[PDB]
């Protein structure tokens, strides 16, 4: 009711400001998209194990991509950056974040408690404490309000697809969260109900199927190829009844776009 439009407008301004550098991986001498994929997949499992909000996961990946836009990291340290990011996102987003010992424990003692704490401080400095970033998740839940009527499977499938985009910096780093959410919502809607991106969201977002097309073409491929992807933790996660087992729904073969 009140503030829904003001908040949307504000998130659309901030997502431009909070966006990582699209090129950053080519400037990283020692890490790759493949290593990032492995890290993000591990963070999904951490979220599983400690029962963290989906929002916490998206925030952490945002912190990582922004950190890596200015800081060169060696491959043996990438997981430390990821652990600190997840700790920060947890402290920001969770009612009950896990304790620091729990974060040390799940890095299989690669790192010490002091390292994790020092990396937390470093990540805060580099991000200049700007932690309140817009995520695909935050756009999705607003878009869900435009369903007629609400459909739990559509919501869950949209969240699953939004989560898959986190894993692959190529191509997803080039799309804004609001755009990825638009593609994931349409694709979910289309898969479950056969319906399309509603004109009511065109009025709200200014996006049409035409302007969502590039992201949607990528996401559709990601969806088709998901069972063959080397990272599988998101598919496993979305088999649970919590998410209505949406990772077992068959993707459509074509979109018409």
């Amino acid at each position: 009711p009140d503030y829904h439009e003001d908040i949307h407008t504000y998130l659309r301004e901030m997502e431009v400001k909070c966006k990582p550098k699209v090129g950053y991986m080519k400037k990283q001498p020692d890490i790759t998209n493949s290593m990032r994929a492995i890290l993000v997949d591990w963070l999904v499992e951490v979220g599983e194990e400690y029962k963290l909000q989906n929002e916490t996961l998206h925030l952490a990946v945002n912190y990582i991509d922004r950190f890596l836009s200015s800081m060169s990291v060696l491959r043996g340290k990438l997981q430390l950056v990821g652990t600190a990011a997840m700790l920060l996102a947890s402290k920001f987003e969770e009612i009950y974040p896990p304790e620091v010992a729990e974060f040390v424990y799940i890095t299989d003692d690669t790192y010490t408690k002091k390292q994790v704490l020092r990396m937390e401080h470093l990540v805060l400095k580099v991000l200049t404490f700007d932690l309140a970033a817009p995520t695909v998740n935050q756009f999705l839940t607003q878009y869900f309000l435009h369903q007629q009527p609400a459909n739990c499977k559509v919501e869950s499938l949209a969240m699953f697809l939004g989560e898959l985009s986190l894993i692959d910096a190529d191509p997803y780093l080039k799309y804004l969260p609001s755009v990825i959410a638009g593609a994931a919502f349409h694709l979910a809607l289309y898969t479950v109900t056969g319906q399309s991106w509603p004109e009511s969201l065109i009025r709200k977002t200014g996006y049409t199927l035409e302007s969502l097309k590039p992201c949607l073409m990528d996401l559709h491929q990601t969806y088709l190829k998901a069972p063959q992807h080397a990272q599988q933790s998101i598919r496993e996660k979305y088999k649970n009844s919590k998410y209505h087992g949406v990772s077992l729904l068959n993707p459509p073969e074509t979109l018409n776009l």
């Binding site: 009711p1 009140d2 503030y3 829904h4 003001d6 908040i7 949307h8 504000y10 998130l11 901030m14 909000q53 929002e55 700790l87 920060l88 402290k91 920001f92 009612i95 974040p97 304790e99 620091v100 408690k113 994790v116 704490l117 937390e120 401080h121 805060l124 400095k125 200049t128 404490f129 700007d130 932690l131 309140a132 998740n137 935050q138 839940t141 607003q142 309000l145």
Partner: protein
């Protein structure tokens, strides 16, 4: 910015981590409040993480300005613009004479501007009370203490069940609703509005149940007519006493028609019907608002 350019003056409060100092920039002359946050082997407190990231997004005349974060090995200093007094101290100094209506109305208008801006930027304050509102010598009042604040989503999910100091805590928190939202800040502001007028707290309970019963005795025990779904709320009990709603002119007797109308909309039971800060800015109570300086040192 760094610690060498600041000269500490006096202690002006102690929240935690814990002290707040008045200090002076030696090169610019600017007077500031230094909130120290001690760095538990659990790293940076989540309360500081939220307080700082939210404050850095909120630049508004009626929200306390975070100027800088001084960021060393074992210490974390937040540098704020300094304000003379908190609203709680001001009301004590006005003990006997009271607070002029134009000031009360000015302060409420400004608090509502401040809060509408928070809510527009998806921030819930969650600890509005007189000691968290700061006033200066020019007639400004500002929201401060964002240590309990949080960035919300649309629509909200379940957030921390604690929240809001008891006297200012909304019925929906007290009845354990799974979802609460911006309406809880408005409830707190309505309590503070009443308190500026009477100079005593509107519902000073000492426990959750005592707090509910005081609200019920003032506003009537809510039924399904006034608040659909209330009798199915988690901490609702069908044994609750059923008090009649009293003449609203008796709740804050000095208030005239427009003030009462506005107060009644801020204290509406159903969070859906409760007035938003944005809509309240346009209430006829404010038709003649000005911004006088406080009438006191």
């Amino acid at each position: 910015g760094s610690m060498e350019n600041f000269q500490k003056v006096e202690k002006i409060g102690e929240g935690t981590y814990g002290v707040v100092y008045k200090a002076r920039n030696k090169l610019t002359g600017e007077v500031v409040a230094l909130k120290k946050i001690r760095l538990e082997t659990e790293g940076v407190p989540s309360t500081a993480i939220r307080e700082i990231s939210l404050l850095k997004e909120l630049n508004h005349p009626n929200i306390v300005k975070l100027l800088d974060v001084i960021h060393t090995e074992n210490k974390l200093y937040l540098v704020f613009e300094f304000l003379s007094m908190d609203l709680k101290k001001f009301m004590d100094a006005s003990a006997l004479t009271g607070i002029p209506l134009p000031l009360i109305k000015s302060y409420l208008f400004q608090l509502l501007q401040g809060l509408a801006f928070c809510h527009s930027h998806r921030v819930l304050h969650r600890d509005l009370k007189p000691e968290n509102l700061l006033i200066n010598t020019e007639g400004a009042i500002k929201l401060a203490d964002f240590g309990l604040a949080r960035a919300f989503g649309v629509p909200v999910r379940t957030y921390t069940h604690e929240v809001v100091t008891l006297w200012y805590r909304a019925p929906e928190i007290l009845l354990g609703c799974k979802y609460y939202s911006t309406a809880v800040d408005i409830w707190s502001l309505g309590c503070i509005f009443a308190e500026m007028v009477t100079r005593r707290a509107l519902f000073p309970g000492d426990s959750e149940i005592d707090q509910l019963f005081r609200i019920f005795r003032t506003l009537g025990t809510p039924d399904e007519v006034v608040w659909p779904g209330v009798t199915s709320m988690p901490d609702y009990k069908p044994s609750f006493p059923k008090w009649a709603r009293q003449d609203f002119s008796k709740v804050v007797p000095p208030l005239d028609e427009d003030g009462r109308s506005l107060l009644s909309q801020m204290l509406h039971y159903d969070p859906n019907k409760r007035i938003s800060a944005k809509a309240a800015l346009a209430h006829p109570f404010f038709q003649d608002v000005t911004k006088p300086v406080p009438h006191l040192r």
